[PDB]
Structure formats: C-alpha cells, structure tokens
C-alpha cells in the first residue's frame, strides 16, 4: 500500500487518479498552478498545493516544485498521469533519487523506449515486427539517404526520434524535397523537443492504428489486455478510439499479445504501457510505445473489467500481478470520443466560461471529465475537456449508445467539437468498421 | 421489431425506456401531463402528446387518454414501466383488445399474481414455499382466526390483497387488537385501492428481503438472473438495494432460481417479473411477485450484463429468449441508492426549482435520472428524482465507489436525501452486510 | 496594503538558524530590500528578500508552517 501520493497532473486524468486513490483508500495531494485552483479534482483532493504560475513550463513541468510539494505533504509516490512529465526519464530518476515512488516504469526503461530509434532496435531484437525504414538515425550522407529511400520504397516519412503528439513528421514523396524536408523537421525538433535527431521510415498508406495494452509488475510477469483501434485521427491526433479492434481475430490477437508480453519481459518492464502497431494485410508493424497510461485506456477497462490505474498503483506499491493471462476475457465493445474545446470548423482552442453543462447518463455510458457549469476553461493548457465512453455487447450497440449520449450532452459558452463527433458516429464507413488512419481527413477533405 | 411504442410513464423509467428504444431503432411517443412539458424524455422523444392536466389521476392514470395517444400516433405497443398502470390488469386487457401490444405479462397473469392470496396459492401449488399465514382471505370466524394465529405463532401482520407501496399493512402482536386492526386496515384499503380484501401472514422479525429476477418469453422458456437484497428499507420502502445478495451461495441461488423459473413456466408468465422473498435460516419464504420491471433492476443489469428493458421490448415483439440459463453469469457486485427530493429528517416532499446540478461520474458509476439545472420538480408526483448505481469487482469496491459518487453529487434548490444515503454508506454494519429488513429504522435510534 | 508572497513551495522559517534571532517582527520596519524570512525546500535554505520599503504590518504564517507558491507571507504598510 501507498500511504499518500501526489497527482502531478490536471483535468480528466487527475480526476481518474484521485478517484482510484479514493477507492483504494490512498490519501491524495493535488498539485496545481495558480490558474487551476478551480479544478474539480483540486476541490475534491485531500490536500492541495499551488506549485507555480499559470504557464505549464512554470507549474507542471517544474520538477523541483512537484518534489517540494511531495516533501512538505509527506507523500510517498508521484503519479504523472499522461502528458507533461509522464514520459520524462529525468523526472523518473529525479523522483527515485529523493526516496519517492514513481508510479510507472524505470528511468532506464523510459530512456530506452523514449527514443524510437532505440525502441525499434529493441523490438527487432525481441522479435516484434517493425516498419522497414532507415534502421538508424539520419546523417548528412545524402547518397546513403537516397539509397535507403530507394531500398525501402517511396513514399517515405521523416519522424523525429523524440517526437510526440503527432508533430515533427513530414511525408516526402521524392528526392526533390528530401533535404528541405529533413532540414525543416530538424528545425521543428530543435524548437519543440530539444533533439534534432530524425529517422526515415516507410510510409504505409492504408494502415490501421492498432495498439496493445500490457500490464507488467517488473518481476517477470506481463499480460496483454486486448487491443484498441485509433484509426479515426486528424493531424495524427486521435479522435475516436475503440476496443477490441474490429476484424482482429482471436488467433491474431493472441499472436500479437503474447509477443508483446514476451517483449515486455525482455526489457524488464514495469507498470502499464502500450505498444502501437500499424495493421495492414494481417501483419503488425511496430511504430512506437507509450510508457504511461494512455488517454484512451477507458475502452480497455470497459471490455475486460480491469481497472488500469488501480493496477498501476498496486504495481508501484510492490504487489505482483493479481491477474493471470487466462483470466482476461474480452466481453463487449467500447467506443470513445474525445470532447475537445475548440472551434469545430477551425480546430482552434476556444477557452471561456461554461455557462450550461449536462453530462449524459445511461446504461453503459461513462463520462470522464472535470468540467462543470460555471467552470472557466483556461487557455494555457491543451484543449481536451472530457471523454465519453459508451459500451455495449457489440459494436452496433456501442455506436447507437454513443449517438444517443452525444445528443443528451450540453456544453454552452464555449466552442466544442461535439458536432464533429456526432457526424463521425453517423458516417456509414465508420459503422462498417476497419477504416484507415487517413479516412477522417479524406472525409473532411480539407 | 416494434415500429413504434408509447411510454406511458414519467421520470427515470421514461428515460430508461426512451434510451432502450433509441438503441433498438424504435420510434417513441412520450405521453405527458400539462405539468411535465420540461421532462428530459419529453424533450428528447420523437413525438409528444399531452394526455391530461397536472394530477396523476387525470393524466398518467387516464387509460382512454393513453389509448387515444397511441391511436393518433400510430403506435404498436405501450410500455407502462413501473407504477401507475404497470400492474393494472384492466389496462392490460383494454390495451390488448384495442389492438396494441402490451409490453408486459398477460392480463390473466396480472390478475392472478396481483391478488396476493391467489399468488401464494399458486406458489404453493408450483412448489414455491410461502410464509405461514391465513392461506386465504380473512372471514368473520374470529375463533378460527385466533386459532390459526396461535398455531402459527404471534406476532402477525394484516396485509391488503391489493395493497402497494408499503401502505395498508398493520402488525398485530396479540388477539386484543386483531379485529380493530383488521377493520381499520380494511377501511384504509377501501380509501386507497378501492378493495377491502385482506389476509393474515406470520411476521418474521429478522428476515432479509431477497428478490429474484425472472425473464420469460411466454413460449415455454424462462430464466433467472441472480438476486437482489433490498433489506435496507424505511417505512416499508426501499432505500438501498444490492446484487447479488451477500451470503447466498451459488447453490441456494440455483435452487431458488430453478424453482422460480419452473413457476414462471407453469403459470405461463411473459415478460420480466420479480419474485420477492424473505430469507432466514437458509430458507426463503415467498411474499409477493412484481409483474413489472422493478425500480432496482439496474443492479441486476450491471452484474449480469443483460439489458432488461431491451429484453422486455424483444419479448413483446414475440422473439423467443435468446439467452440460455447457462449463459447467465454474475460478475461483480452492484449497489444502488435512491435519491429523493424530500427532507432528510422529516421525509416530506420538497418540490422546487433546481438551481444547480452536477451529476457524478467515473468508472463503474451509472447515474439514471431526469433532472437538470433549471428543472422544477412538480409536487403532484412521487418524490424520486434519480437512482445512483455503482458496480465493482466486490462489495467493498462498490461501496467505496458509492461513497465517492455520493460525495460528488450536487443538488441544490431543493432538499434531497443525499446525506442520509452517505450515512447509510458509512454504517459499519451495512459495510459488513447481512442486515435485517428493520436495521435502518433502528439506526435512527427512536 | 502591500503583500509579499512566498516564491516557492516549502517550509516557512523565521530564524535563519533554529537557535538564532528572528529576522523581523511586527512594528520595526524594513527598507526597500533586505532579508525578511526563510523558505526551505529540498534543504537548500532560501532567503526571501523584501521589495517594498515600509512598516511590517503583520506576518501571517508561523515558523515551520509549509507554504505554497504565492502564499501571503507578510503585509507591509
């Protein structure tokens, strides 16, 4: 057991972690900035500590401030949630230095899987398939670069090793723009992640983003909980995630899952992770791994009944895995929709006061959000304000429940992307299932 | 399926029926009174028809009005839900004769099981044990009455045959007040239900109200779906239900379920019904049967995964039961709390506008209600404004989840029994479980 | 009613050492800039200078009491 933990995050994940803590009887410390005093989890937390001013670089990315909050409150662990410092190896080792428990993998594990150039190598060593590509960082040897591009086959995509959030990616169709594309990708990587390293990979045009969720306790045990299907993306930022992935037969599911679990055992992984694969022609092609709880993880919770955050807390506390591989059973189909706060026709964030708010209810509808009537959405942080997960005995029931629950939801005073979700739900190809990662941009066409 | 149905009810059950209809691609007609034009299901329904003035006796109990509303809109079914006309055999026969499917049991079965004396006789015939009692309507032979009372053993209780809602029931300790109690209970029954028939039954002082859920398609098939322990009651009205009942081993569950399924097959039941019981010394004693979907069915839905109202709609359409008895599996534990708009101390209704409202959410928490910010709770109807169901992998997880959810719920502008529910949740004996049907009243210490 | 607020999360101390004299007290005033109190976080004692010349109207947090970012520490004038 953990006596007390610090929720070093905000918004929906902070509520999730606080609520799991309350269930497990763990005392919660909610560190916030000076503009986050109004957050629902901050008002529901046992102790609250204002760690910095509004900007993220001064409040939530401030490792010393979070450590000081943990120190003064006498906490024993720190849950980073997702975003900010969840995948920060410096945060991991700096939290572990000071005698605090980092709820997540080890610092070395985050360093290894944190740069895709090394993660791909480790996966190839472990037998997990990977997309053919540069198989190494890109240098200035332009002749070698073009030879590699010819070998793999055009088109090609340049991806930053430290890239995240869908940025720092450029698609190159020919040698004409290769150098300029590489230069601009390096510049963006320098300006964003402080790492100009880039690598080139084959650009599959009809894949399906299928990711595996795995729980490992760091003691030689690891399990895999079904998968997901995040193929409904815009600008490489997911919009609708669902599990289990349609069309993935139990044979293929087990084949990929057991290999993922073996790979987890290979690197001595700990806590909850996620392997991201591209699905095409029945072959999986690893692209990256997320060493943290994923935003869309609630879909995996509603089909297996396994609370992932409580599993993370138990694993951090030292207890081994209490779930056997044979005990995991997929019963149903869940579909999630991220409700952002932005102009639906311009995808620009829209901060402002929420005058009316009414969350939907019903049998199998989960609403995961921190907003409430009279909550002023701040402009400093990301635009996501909630998630809506609907569950049913089959995909059609889940989609119908989603369509019903999207109409029953009211959010006034700010420009939110609920109508986009409603029109995505009504799309016929989506109802068919198995659409590709580029389908949504084609549907919008602009 | 049914082309269109009429929801001859209001409040939470109306939303439950509307949502089940929407998921199934069924059009909905929402009949309402003149004071219920702001109900959520009315504003979400496909069609709306006003059937009468504010009072229930003129609008929601006006069988001709509901039949007319079904006729003009071209409906093909009428779903009564619970209360009002759900257990009105006259309504069933009139609806079926007019040419509309009645979503529920047959008129004959409603007549048979509604009369508690005939229900007890049929249960004894079919092998269902019953509480020792008069075994028939009370006569004028006071000598025989007192002889039977002495034989079974005092105390005894006089219960109206057509009684409901916990009214028209009187407990008798000895022969002194038997005649006067019987006469006054008969007068009360005349005043309330227009039926003075009464019967006498043995009074068990430490029972546990256990009820079984049975689904039967009326074609010779019937199944049972776990049970529910509604022990926590005040004034003979349930406050907290849970499912499955603690301490009822799977052997007893299968035993009573097989007996109840056989009884349903024998009496030609159709639809969804509930067999109430009293549990003591490992033996059940039938008391009454509810020929309608119950207020606390969501707990059964959440532990078994079977949508009960959708099953009702499918059975009414004639489809045979697609769920076998071996395919019904109980997985977890659900606890439900009824939220009423009343004084937590004086237990009197508190109608009024709701100035703010922020419903609870999270993992494994269902909020089934019809209120919103600005809703004006009318004084003409029952005081229930919503139900709150929480599900977990065991009783303790579900109760902790319930505590969090109750702490998270906001209802202002009226007086609501939320603090009482929190108190019940915090009771140590309730957390241990197995409390008797009189525990809550004794908890008040009066 | 100028308020000087703590710039970091830590424990608030008056005396720079456990058995030394307090930096300031109500009454006696302070100049534009000078040490006013101590906030300790992760060890590494940090001294909070003053920004306004004026009289120490009041001090709101006792010694050893944890303080958060922008916690009202003292009121000057």
């Amino acid at each position: 057991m953990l006596d007390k933990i610090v929720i070093a995050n905000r918004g929906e994940i902070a509520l999730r972690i606080l609520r799991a803590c309350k269930e497990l009887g763990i005392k919660t410390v909610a560190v916030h900035s000076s503009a986050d005093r109004d957050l629902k989890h901050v008002l529901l937390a046992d102790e609250t500590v204002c760690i910095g001013p509004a900007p993220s670089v001064k409040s939530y990315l401030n490792i010393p401030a979070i450590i000081s909050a943990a120190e003064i409150t006498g906490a024993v662990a720190i849950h980073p949630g997702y975003g900010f410092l969840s995948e920060n190896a410096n945060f991991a080792e700096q939290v572990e230095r000071s005698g605090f428990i980092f709820i997540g993998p080890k610092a070395e594990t985050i360093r290894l899987m944190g740069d895709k150039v090394s993660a791909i190598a480790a996966m190839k060593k472990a037998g997990v398939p990977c997309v053919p590509g540069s198989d190494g960082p890109l240098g200035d040897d332009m002749d070698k670069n073009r030879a590699i591009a010819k070998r793999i086959g055009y088109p090609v995509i340049i991806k930053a090793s430290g890239g995240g959030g869908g940025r720092g990616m450029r698609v190159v169709r020919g040698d004409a723009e290769l150098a300029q594309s590489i230069s601009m990708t390096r510049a963006e990587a320098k300006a964003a992640f402080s790492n100009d390293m880039v690598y080139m990979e084959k650009y599959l045009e009809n894949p399906r983003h299928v990711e595996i969720q795995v729980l490992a306790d760091g003691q030689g045990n690891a399990i895999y909980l079904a998968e997901r299907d995040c193929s409904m993306q815009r600008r490489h930022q997911k919009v609708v995630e669902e599990a289990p992935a349609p069309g993935i037969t139990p044979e293929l599911r087990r084949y990929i899952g057991e290999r993922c679990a073996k790979a987890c055992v290979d690197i001595g992984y700990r806590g909850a992770g996620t392997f991201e694969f591209l699905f095409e022609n029945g072959e999986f092609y690893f692209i990256e791994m997320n060493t943290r709880i994923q935003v869309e993880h609630p879909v995996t919770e509603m089909i297996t009944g396994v609370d992932l955050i409580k599993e993370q807390l138990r694993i951090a506390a030292g207890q081994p895995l209490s779930i056997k591989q044979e005990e995991v059973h997929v019963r149903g189909h869940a579909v999630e929709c991220r409700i952002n706060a932005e102009d639906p026709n311009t995808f620009l964030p829209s901060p402002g006061k929420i005058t009316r708010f009414h969350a939907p209810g019903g049998f199998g509808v989960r609403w995961e959000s921190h907003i409430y009537a009279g909550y002023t959405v701040p402009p400093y942080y990301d635009s996501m304000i909630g998630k809506l997960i609907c569950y049913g005995e089959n995909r059609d029931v889940a989609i119908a429940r989603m369509k019903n629950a999207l109409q029953e939801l009211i959010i006034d005073g700010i420009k939110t992307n609920v109508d986009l979700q409603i029109r995505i739900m009504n799309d016929e190809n989506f109802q068919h299932g198995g659409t590709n990662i580029h389908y949504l941009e084609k549907k919008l066409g602009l | 399926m049914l082309d269109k149905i009429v929801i001859a009810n209001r409040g939470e059950i109306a939303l439950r029926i509307l949502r089940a209809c929407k998921e199934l691609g069924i059009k909905t007609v929402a009949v309402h009174s003149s004071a219920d034009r702001d109900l959520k299901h009315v504003l979400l329904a496909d069609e709306t028809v006003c059937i009468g003035p504010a009072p229930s006796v003129k609008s929601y109990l006006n069988i001709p009005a509901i039949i007319s509303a079904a006729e003009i809109t071209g409906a093909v079914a009428i779903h009564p839900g619970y209360g009002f006309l759900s257990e009105n055999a006259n309504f069933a026969e009139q609806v079926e004769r007019s040419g509309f499917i009645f979503i529920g049991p047959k008129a004959e079965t409603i007549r048979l099981m509604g009369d508690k004396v005939s229900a007890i006789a049929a249960m004894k015939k079919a092998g269902v044990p019953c509480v020792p009692g008069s075994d028939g309507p009370l006569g004028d032979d006071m000598d025989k009455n007192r002889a039977i009372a002495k034989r079974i053993g005092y105390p005894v209780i006089i219960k109206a045959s057509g009684g409901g809602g916990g009214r028209g029931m009187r407990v008798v300790r000895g022969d002194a007040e038997l005649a006067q109690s019987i006469s006054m209970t008969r007068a009360e029954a005349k005043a309330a239900f227009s039926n003075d028939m009464v019967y006498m039954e043995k009074y068990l002082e430490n029972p546990r109200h256990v009820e079984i859920q049975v689904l039967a398609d009326g074609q010779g098939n019937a199944i049972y779906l776990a049970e529910r322990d509604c022990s926590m009651q005040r004034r003979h009205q349930k406050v907290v239900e849970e499912a499955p009942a603690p301490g009822i081993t799977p052997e007893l569950r299968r035993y009573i379920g097989e007996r109840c399924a056989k009884a349903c097959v024998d009496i030609g039941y159709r639809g969804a019904g509930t067999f109430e019981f009293l549990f003591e010394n490992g033996e059940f004693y039938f008391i009454e049967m509810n020929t309608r979907i119950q207020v606390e069915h969501p707990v059964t839905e959440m532990i078994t995964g079977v949508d009960l109202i959708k099953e009702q709609l499918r059975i009414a359409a004639g489809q045979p039961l697609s769920i076998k008895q071996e395919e019904v599996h109980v997985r977890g534990h659900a606890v439900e709390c009824r939220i009423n708009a009343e004084d937590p101390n004086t237990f009197l209704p508190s109608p009024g506008k709701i100035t703010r409202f922020h419903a609870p959410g999270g993992f494994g928490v269902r909020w089934e209600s019809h209120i919103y910010a600005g809703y004006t709770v009318p004084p003409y109807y029952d005081s229930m404004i919503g139900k709150l169901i929480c599900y977990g992998e065991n009783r303790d997880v579900a109760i902790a989840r319930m505590k969090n959810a109750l702490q998270e719920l906001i209802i202002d502008g009226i007086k609501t029994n939320v603090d009482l529910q929190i108190r019940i949740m915090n009771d140590e004996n309730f957390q241990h479980g197995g409390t008797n049907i009189h525990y809550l009243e004794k908890k008040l210490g009066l | 009613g100028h308020i000087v607020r703590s710039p970091m999360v830590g424990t608030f101390y008056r005396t720079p050492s456990p058995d030394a004299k307090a930096f300031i007290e109500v009454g006696q005033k302070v100049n534009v800039g000078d040490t006013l109190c101590i906030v300790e976080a992760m060890k590494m004692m940090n001294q909070i200078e003053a920004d306004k010349s004026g009289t120490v109207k009041a001090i709101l947090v006792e010694s050893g009491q944890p303080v958060e970012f922008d916690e009202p520490l003292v009121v000057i004038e």
Binding site: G74, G99 | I410 | -
Partner: peptide
C-alpha cells in the same frame, strides 16, 4: 457542495527525508 470549498492549510508535522547528495 464541493465547489464552495475553502483550502485548509497543510499539517506542519509531516517529514519526508531527501538525501543530501
């Protein structure tokens, strides 16, 4: 309600050692 909450100060007597190094 939980919206109308007033922050209560932390308990001073809570120690969490941090290595000097």
């Amino acid at each position: 309600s939980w919206i109308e909450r007033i922050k209560s100060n932390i308990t001073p007597t809570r120690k969490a050692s941090i290595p000097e190094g």
